[PDB]
Design a binder for this molecule. Sequence first.
Ligand SMILES: [Cl-]
Length: 137
Amino acid sequence: AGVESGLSSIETVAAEGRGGYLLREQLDDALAHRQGSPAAYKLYLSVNEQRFARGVRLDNVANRFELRMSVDWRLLDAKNGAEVHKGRTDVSVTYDSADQPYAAIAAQQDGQERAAAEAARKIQLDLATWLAGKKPA
Ligand SMILES: [Cl-]
């Protein structure tokens, strides 16, 4: 209850990029932070955007790609900018592309969404564990 109230007090900040945009969108959903709401924490996301835009072709299977989302992140106190928690999250997904360009792009974008969703889930669990420490006994 207070942990869920604490999670939605976290405002996710990302610099220009598809990865940070997708991860921020996923975290705003997972954290339940409503835009315009008061923020107790600022979560800064540093996605390796070049690595995230690159789907790497795999051997053995035709049009199979591996996509990697690497994120360094800092949790700050929204009032004084002190770093109160940090982390590193590395997520990998595969997508099975197609000879057709529309389908090939759809597969890649779905892979990117799935990477961002799993990265969001890993960070949300890490932050919920941190905010759970905050709950009295
Ligand atoms: Cl993590």
